[PDB]
């Protein structure tokens, strides 16, 4: 039913300040909760947005609403605020509690890489073995945050697809991978496949073919 | 001042049926002043809010999970329970217990640690590895790219070891996807020499220890390609 909307990554140099954006049909008349979480910790509520009182967040926290988007700014913002940032809401419709998707907020600590993508068609070996994987290799970038589509035959593929997420590496970068999972007549069929890697408002694009 | 703590089952077959527990201290089960909560987050991925539970006896769902999701209380060890019938491997996922409060709309203030859940059989199953060949595109001249597939095994964890550790400048071993079948794949890259590409041997070493099986595989380059 009810959706709220959140950029999927954000990053900030420190001393700057972070403003995650949270999407919903007129949140601005409801409560507008945020939740921080570090990796393998639950989250911790930032944003108490009390009813009919003031607000409830450590220092330079502060969730702000207007129509459709409501915000959470953090001001001088400091390494240990890296974390994912979720928003949740009551639709009263309804009766249910709703979440976004999650912002990997990034402190930028070093300078920024593109990711070097790398695509590997099916092995002649696994086509034997009535198998086919793409396997779409994503390295050297920062900050760690990557969002992965399959397609093409131009047309949007999901469904085949998994996608780990990013890992520190060995040169201090980032590292992901994606796979899309076929059976050798659909590998057959279609002329081209493309694993497209977005990254901070960039596309690094591969495609292979059953030549 | 409310603290929480989930037991569950670490996995649980397909079909059958997940039963969860979770302990409150700090609060009373029994306040007017809470619900209480499950919520999951699938490995790298979003939170979920799964159900919240009443003393009093109100239940909410998440609408896509209504039909499999039971909740239950017990005032006198002060804990509640989920249940989700017909699992599936998209269950997958850590399950949290959080203290529901009731004011401003609703929000948990007071949260679990995790447990996972992996929804698979427990069956233990070492992989099919194939290679990932050098292109003439694998190459950004120099460099070429080549690797191994390790595909379809379980459970966790898989080695991957270069030539025989005798390789290892150049080599990033990516974590691995659960994948819906119930099962992992990974994959392992390695940088080398493309002039000596048509000279040269390398071999993946992957060592599955929850099978004992350990598989060489070597990876040549793409045949039509060969330079002679």
């Known amino acids: 039913s009810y959706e709220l909307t959140q950029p999927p990554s954000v990053s900030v140099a420190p001393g700057k300040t972070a403003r995650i954006t949270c999407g919903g049909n007129?949140?601005?008349?409801?409560?507008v909760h945020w939740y921080q979480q570090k990796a393998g910790q639950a989250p911790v509520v930032v944003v108490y947005?009390?009813?009919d009182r003031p607000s409830g967040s450590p220092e330079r926290f502060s969730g702000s609403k207007s129509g459709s988007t409501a915000t959470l700014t953090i001001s001088r913002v400091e390494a240990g605020d890296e974390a994912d940032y979720y928003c949740?809401?009551?639709?009263?419709?309804?009766?249910?509690?709703?979440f976004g998707g999650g912002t990997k907020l990034t402190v930028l600590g070093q300078p920024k890489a593109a990711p070097s993508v790398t695509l590997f068609p099916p092995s002649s070996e696994e086509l034997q073995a009535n198998k086919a994987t793409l396997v779409c290799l994503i390295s050297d970038f920062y900050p760690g945050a990557v969002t992965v589509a399959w397609k093409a035959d131009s047309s949007p593929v999901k469904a085949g697809v998994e996608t780990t997420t990013p890992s520190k590496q060995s040169n201090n970068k980032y590292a992901a991978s994606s796979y899309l999972s076929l059976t050798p007549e659909q590998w057959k069929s279609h002329r081209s496949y493309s694993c497209q890697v977005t990254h901070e408002g960039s596309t690094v694009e591969k495609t292979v073919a059953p030549t | 001042q409310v603290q929480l703590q989930e037991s569950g089952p670490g996995l649980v077959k397909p079909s059958e049926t997940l039963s969860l527990t979770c302990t409150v201290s700090?609060?009373?089960?029994?306040?007017?002043?809470?619900?209480w909560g499950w919520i999951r987050q699938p490995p790298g991925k979003g939170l979920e809010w799964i159900g919240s539970?009443?003393?009093?006896?109100?239940?909410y769902y998440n609408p896509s999970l209504k039909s499999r999701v039971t909740i239950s209380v017990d005032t006198s060890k002060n804990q509640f329970s989920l249940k989700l019938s017909s699992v599936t491997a998209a269950d997958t996922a850590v399950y949290f217990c959080?203290?529901?409060?009731?004011?401003?709309?609703?929000?948990?203030?007071?949260w679990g640690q995790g447990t996972l859940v992996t929804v698979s059989s427990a069956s233990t199953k070492g992989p099919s590895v194939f290679p990932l060949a050098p292109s003439s595109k694998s190459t950004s001249g120099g460099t070429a790219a080549l690797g191994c597939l390790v595909k379809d095994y379980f459970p966790e964890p898989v080695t991957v070891s270069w030539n025989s550790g005798a390789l290892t400048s150049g080599v990033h071993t990516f974590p691995a996807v659960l994948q819906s079948s119930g099962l992992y794949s990974l994959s392992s890259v390695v940088t080398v020499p493309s002039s000596s590409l048509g000279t040269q041997t390398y071999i993946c070493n992957v060592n599955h220890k929850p099978s004992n099986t350990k598989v060489d595989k070597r990876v040549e380059p793409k045949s039509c390609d060969k330079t002679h």
């Open positions: 959080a203290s529901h409060w009731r004011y401003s709309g609703g929000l948990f203030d007071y």
């Open positions: 700090g609060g009373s089960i029994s306040s007017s002043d809470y619900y």
């Open positions: 539970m009443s003393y009093s006896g109100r239940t």
């Open positions: 007129n949140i601005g008349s409801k409560n």
């Open positions: 947005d009390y009813t």
């Open positions: 949740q809401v009551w639709d009263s419709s309804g009766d249910h509690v709703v």
